[model samples]
Target chain A: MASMERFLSVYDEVQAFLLDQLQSKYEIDPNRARYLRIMMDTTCLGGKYFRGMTVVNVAEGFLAVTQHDEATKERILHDACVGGWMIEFLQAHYLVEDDIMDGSVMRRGKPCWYRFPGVTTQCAINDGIILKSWTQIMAWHYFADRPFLKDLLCLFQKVDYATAVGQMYDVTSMCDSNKLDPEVAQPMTTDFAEFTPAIYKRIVKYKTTFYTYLLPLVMGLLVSEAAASVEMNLVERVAHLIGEYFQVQDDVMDCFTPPEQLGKVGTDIEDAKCSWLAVTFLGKANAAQVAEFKANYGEKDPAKVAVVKRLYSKANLQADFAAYEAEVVREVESLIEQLKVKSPTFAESVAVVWEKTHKR
Target chain B: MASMERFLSVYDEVQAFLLDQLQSKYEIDPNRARYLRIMMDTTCLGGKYFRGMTVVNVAEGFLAVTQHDEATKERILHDACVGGWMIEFLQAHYLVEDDIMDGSVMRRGKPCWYRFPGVTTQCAINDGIILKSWTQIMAWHYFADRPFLKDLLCLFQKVDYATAVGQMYDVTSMCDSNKLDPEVAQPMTTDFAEFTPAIYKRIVKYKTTFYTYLLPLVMGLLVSEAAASVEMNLVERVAHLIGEYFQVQDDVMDCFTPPEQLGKVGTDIEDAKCSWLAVTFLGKANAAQVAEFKANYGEKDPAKVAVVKRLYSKANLQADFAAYEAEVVREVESLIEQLKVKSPTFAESVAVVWEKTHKR
Candidate 1:
């Protein structure tokens, strides 16, 4: 089977395990148990499962050097898959709140969970709390006896807080709003001056990169039995490079990829999101171009979005991103080659990630 | 020093300890650090410290029976206090989200944190995430080496999930709204038929009882030096009885207590909260009385609220609750008598909680 096929197989058993555990451990009303069961399925499943599949894939690569017995090997592999889905639960927790915060209409081509039938702001916020709770509940269970559990939890804590702070910069820097109380954060506007590369890097590093790229590899390393031996800090160094490249890919893909291929319509411009293309376009624009970019950007009409896209073409941003992708691949390849000197197995695992990341 | 005086002293130290820990341990950007620090004080501080003080109070009671030397005694007591504030951290996490969900304007006689200057829906949600993240972040650090840490973590996970589900039943069962989609949860209305006492018990048990009554005492038990020696399950049994009485008191107090004493405006009637008094009034009201109750129960104006309060008077709920309070006192005192035979030290702690809870 494919990576996702095997990944989702674990999700079924873990979902059942989680639901059953709620009844057996908590002994809460069965009515509550059923309510949780459906919400778990509703929220955690249905993603691309890419981030989750990374935990499985990288661990599969790391487990190559282990000498465990078959039963132990089976147990560890199953546990890795469970972590993969728990990581999905983590991702879902972030995304659900992101949907509410963004006032998003759709996610992965359907109504966001906040927009689910009769689900309003409060239901979304409360349910999002359960998502984060269940994510920790499962991890605290699976890693209960592992010596690495301390570091594992700290990793999630680090990444969770970073994303939260990243959200602070992103939200406070986006479209300015008139509030019910007007004394707080109004500097966030459609002004091109606020669209700086330095802050954009901070946003992506803390918000998107740490959770997306850094966590999966380190988690895979921790789960590997041979991992207690430790290796070069190649994973840490390369995470920044790869995650920056990855989010840039996301930004460009939002604009250039068709809904058929991309699976969702582009909204970065419509939503006034601070994007790499937007930053780069403004970086090179003349006075009139900057004027038109400011006027058309952050508006909700198709005509406005068309003008923004036309401005990106005028700057040849598509070619610029194509060139940026090549440089990222070379830099990552160079890093992996250097990593081979200290640990070939770790290098091989990272190379697998780089190979996948450089593609769609 | 008084019980709260000692507790507040620990809060001073923990606040400094937490702020320093963020910089030294996480090494997050200082700007992000300052954002977190202010928001921590904004959201977590300013409560009565009642729940947190319970952890300290009960642990102090249990420690009186221990044989540890002075230095060891100081360390465990200090840690117990840390856990106490961490418990407050847990309480604040719940309350910030509660303020958002209930659309509450004032919490503890100030603008709800969500209504803070420049704050709106997204800022409140993201900040609440950080509140929970820091609560666990600090606990995972403080308990990194303790033997009972696993169970301590488990206690939090249990209460957190139970409270989340409790919120579900509470929100889905009150003040129904026409949604943008109008699909999933329309049954949550001011309809008296939906306000049955059985479901009210479930809400209190899962939502209020577990976190409010049970977790604090059990937390003290765990923090006590004699905890590992093990005691009878008296704390488990009495949690339900005390929490029920406590919430019944809260329901009645919301109407009877003024903002001067209560420290905030009462909106249980206006917000159509599923209070014990509401449940009891509906249980005894005639058809015409019930119809009038429904029409005015969820309205915003004070005249409508006065009508709801007057209807409660018509049903003689005040006299009924006074009678109910006596029955509760008898049952709780009777249980404490039985508990003393099993563990007098535990009974002493229970009596202390009862003494304070039964008061304002």
Candidate 2:
């Protein structure tokens, strides 16, 4: 709570930067400016800010300036927050477009950006481009003078490209391209052959985890030229392991977690997303169960969704997922020791990230 | 024709790079990779290539490497072509999403990506993301070692941001937010108050001008490190003049030009776009004419559209636009002289661009 509260203060600067930029550079009119602000207020705020908090918090372990005077530390903290919120910016970029793509109605407990008054799918599509564009803008604005500016700027785009690649797979793997519907929502169907573990890993690794788990840590490391001395292999390995673990957790929790804690209703089943639980259940389900799962999964019908849920419990997926979760954590802990051998600060920074997500 | 023929050969490299990237980095499935290639083949190719030619041809005036060995000139030419093709990537990015937002069907004589079977709106939305992401990827791949890499990379996002700002205004200015529709095509209406000259300039400058006219020149200048020594004020002013001229030309031709040459069926009147002619006529038309114009504009009916077209000729907008276009070219030639005073190399580079668009 404290970490998020502190980090969210950087959001004000983001707004300030945006307003000035809109006024000075773009010279946009007041009415349209008001609407742009509204779009930002809705999409940028209300997130859990875990990814953002990790950037500011994990970055602290690598920053020598953290030990300086209060003002210096504040400045450094502000820098970390900029990196953090840009990730937030990246998150909003994905979510706004993803909601529209997935035909999602609600996001983070509110109607998606496209549903906002006058900001239908057309405006929302443009809004997604603006949201992604800001990641580079802020990278240039905040970090232009730094030696690592090039790396930081490239990192934002590189990770985003990777994530977009992941999303491409995520959507494509659901059904054959021949069956896609332009006007309606995904004609959700269970083409169970496309739901393999390898592709699922690609989807998670590229789409959610790279942006969510790895980016925040790598951003922090780069901030201090901690990247110069750091073993990105170790960092990347840790990120991969950590990201895989988190995504698997998300898959497990998607079905089990209530909508209240989840913030948005889970659509993994209805959207026919390649979730860990879905893949696990498929591998374990008997011929009758597989038949049942194929027939019932991915429909908009609540009764159909419930049938899929019932299959999950029947197979005791929660227990198996918990076991898989424990093993990943054990592997992470082992790697952290390896990280400690390479660089204690890097290990410690990752540990900070680990501690934050430890229980969940 | 020869320039375009030579410039288009670089496109093969773009596809090669994409294939390697999708395979090596993304490890995307074969089916998805094929679809991405199809998207590129559809959207990335087939443009007039004027913007692309501007990047390569204008870049030559500034490059010292051109005076070196034959192999050196070819390598430098390849580098400029890399810059050129990325602009093509930017155009595809804009057009793919623009077609969707506009509810457009045919683009450059082929069906829109979203309109294609198996490539519905969801896939198309993701395709837009992938298209924009390639600009940054190509920038990094080609120019990471260049001194101006930061400026060039940031330029891609910065210009993209400005264009999105323009698009936001473009969408919102047509109607009130309360009237927006999410599921259907735009509710086109001739809101006379929102259709002001000031807003029209904003749309043209930010959305069309910045990306189309200015970026290609600057990308070329950046290639030779000419940006450090050049006067951007003159170059930017020239772009502003050039782009405004082109868009106004487009608006006039939307009614006058044949569909074969236009490639797209003009929808400015139907889409309620803030076109130059629309505003010019709105300002000049009398009470009865304004009423008739309002009634007929922005309708699906062919009769309604023809009625509006009749009003344009009645007001003789093409004659007025011809006078306006001549004055703009005069102002641009004046700016080119100012440019010539600053740096002859820079002047020659811009001249290279001016001659490319002089007729059309």
Candidate 3:
């Protein structure tokens, strides 16, 4: 409860800081200012700030493990919050562009930014660029004098580029498999037999993990530890292991949770998303069940979705998930144990992240 | 002819470098590589490379003025070409998003990237982000060791952000003035009578000047000169003065050039864009002509477009443009003279840039 409350406070502070910057930096014309004001309010605000809060919490744990003084903690915490805000900005920008790309009409129980009245897709495109631009500008604003500013900028740029590359795979992998065109060559298919956990994990690594878990943890280490001292390899290995688990957990919850609980109907199956259930069930199902799954998966029909869900039930995916969940926890603990021998600070921060998702 | 030949070679090198990096960087999936490969080929290669070529040419001129050794000149030229290629990437990304935003069908003669087979608006947005990401990645890849790397990164971020700010004004200023809704509070009206030169120039400064002219020039200086030694204030003023002319020239050319020559039908009036002609005509037109301009502008009808053009002729906008063009050249020359007193290298670079547009 304390951690969650602190995370909310950081989130609010980030939003206010962003609004203040927007006002000062672009006070050129009333209309221009209004466009930015709306963009900041609509896009940057209202998220759960999951990835963002990780920056603060992870940094806090790292600082605590190092036994930093209160003044040192305060300064570093302020810096971590900026990194956290950058993550929020990054996520907000992604959502604006993603919503338009995914054809999502409603987000967070309201219309997507593009769907707002009088805001055309053009505005959405520019707004996405604006949001992305702010990520760079904000980094320079806060971290320009820091010794590791170059590394920080490079890290953000590399991750952003990696995400786009991952997005390429995600989008191209889901191209209409029915279309026999060379361009749509890698579309995700109804042929469930071709599904592999390796490919699924690859997508997760590039699309989600790099920015989500790895970024915040790595950024935390970069802020507290000397640039040469931080072992990014260890951080990458641990963060990615957890990030994979995080995404897998999300996929599991998407299928198992109700619309009311998830806050939106899970459309992963219908959208032809490469979900864990789809892939895992394909591996477990017999020939008849595999055929049944293939025929029904990725269709909009409620009956078809139900057929797929029944296959999951028959295959005992809930049991499979439970076992996988236990295994992931064991692997993460062992990794942290390995890090503990090298750096307990890293271990402590990793544990803090793990604790957040222990039950869910 | 020598300059032209060198420009062509640099352009080819840029494309090859971009493709090779794409190949080596993200070798995860063949389909993903192919998507990026197609994107680079389609968007980056086709443009005039106007902004891009300026990066190389300006750097060349600056190096010459500084009288660097041949070896140093060669080394810096290579780096400048990388910067040049980045400008191309920047421009390519902008065109992809811009085409989608403006509902443009064809670009550089072929269908826009978004209009290509199996490519949706979603893919275009991601592609744009990818292009932008590549610009930063390539910069780090090439110039990580440079003294002014931070300056270069910050320069790109600031200009890119400024461009978005400009775009906000451009989009909002043209909002449909007739809509009384709060959302349409800032609609740009068809009333050419209300168009002002200050508003027109402001958009040009933020949107076009900063990225198109100022960025290349400043980047060149950063690469060659000490960051503090480079007078950005003078560079900004001169680049913007020329950039205003450049856009107003585009506006004039959009109206005057035939579709075949221009490569597309002029849509400034139809789109209700804040063009130099629009502002100038408002200042020149009679009350009856103003009313006619208001009624006819921004309509899709060819007849309406023709009526607006006729009003331009009646207002003698061609003559006005001729005078405006001469004055811009004079202002640029004077700016260059002023820059020469402070920094001959900058003046030389500015002259090189000016020479490209001197006749046109």
lDDT tens digits by residue: candidate 3, B151-256: 7888888888888878866765565333423244335565443368887887788878888998888777777764454566788888988888888888888889
Pairs that clash in candidate 3: A173-A188, B174-B188, B175-B187, B175-B188
Worst 10 residues of 1 chain B by lDDT: B175-184
DockQ of predicted model 1? 0.47
For candidate 3, lDDT tens digit of each residue in A1-360?
Answer: 365566556656655555667567654644445556667778877866777777777677766657777887877877777787788788888888988888887777767888776676878888888887877776887787887687778888888877877776666554533442324423546564435788787778878788988888777766665434446677888877888888888888778888777766777777777788888987777889988887887888999988888888889888888888889888899888887776776678788888886675
lDDT per residue as tens, model 1, B1-360: 466777788777777777777667444555555656777787778777777888888777766887878887676777777778777887788888888877888877788877877667677778888777776776777778887676777887788788887787677557432222224654437466658778677777777888888888888878774554434355666888899888888888898788878878888887787898889998888899989998898778999999998898879997878888898899889878877776687787788889888876
User: What's the candidate order when arranged by decreasing TM-score?
Assistant: 2, 3, 1
TM (chain A) per model: 0.91, 0.91, 0.89
Ranking by DockQ: 3, 1, 2
- Docking quality band of candidate 2, CAPRI definitions: acceptable
Model 2: per-residue Cα lDDT over B276-306, one tens digit each: 8889999888899899988988778889988
lDDT: worst 10-residue window of model 2 chain B? B177-186
